[PDB]
Write a protein that binds this ligand. Sequence first.
Ligand SMILES: COC(=O)[C@H](Cc1cccc(C(=N)N)c1)NC(=O)CNS(=O)(=O)c1ccc(C)cc1
Ligand SMILES: [Ca+2]
Length: 223
Amino acid sequence: IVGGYTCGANTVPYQVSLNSGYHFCGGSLINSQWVVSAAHCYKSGIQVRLGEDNINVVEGNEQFISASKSIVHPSYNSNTLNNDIMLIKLKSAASLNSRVASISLPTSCASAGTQCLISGWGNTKSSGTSYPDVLKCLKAPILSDSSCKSASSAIITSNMFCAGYLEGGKDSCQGDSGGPVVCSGKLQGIVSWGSGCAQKNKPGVYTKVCNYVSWIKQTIASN
Ligand SMILES: COC(=O)[C@H](Cc1cccc(C(=N)N)c1)NC(=O)CNS(=O)(=O)c1ccc(C)cc1
Ligand SMILES: [Ca+2]
């Protein structure tokens, strides 16, 4: 996260860290046994870490649980990042409490102008690299599709939405991928892609979760 602030230990209880010997992606706990993340974060041998703040120090509220199954969206296109979403089932249900909680799925799609909370342990520099050990937070508004396409010229599908600032300076970054974008207490997006980080007229692009609720629900019900 670039231009954000330190969230505070466990103030974002649904945030998870995907670890394969090191943190490589974020994720969101949607219930005691399932996590949602980005399809481009797919990898075998994933361990989910819950209740994390400083990912390099055992602080006492963590739950480390291995994944038993990973399900990338059937229509994920790695070239365009369309349908960049994946579900991860935990080998065992996590113990939910004040520091480890799930985030609800949306019942409707959020509108441009809505303020959302984005979080992660990704790079904090727009130029060069500097990885924080504690969770960073960023408040950012959903941008209109027209204002976005008009700025980045990049290809934005109906399963994506831009959030951030066209002036640059604040944005999600490398290592934040798969992380949550929460608006109105519901999971509305997943950190997906962008051109560099916090560059002017290059806002972050997120997976539009409201379009996948049916798939998520059905998949969780049969797996
Ligand atoms: C990959 O390294 C990076 O610094 C960022 C990471 C990232 C991830 C998720 C969201 C954001 C964000 N800004 N909100 C940033 N992405 C890039 O810089 C990618 N742009 S890119 O134009 O460099 C590019 C595009 C496609 C390929 C195969 C490789 C590189
Ligand atoms: Ca820790």
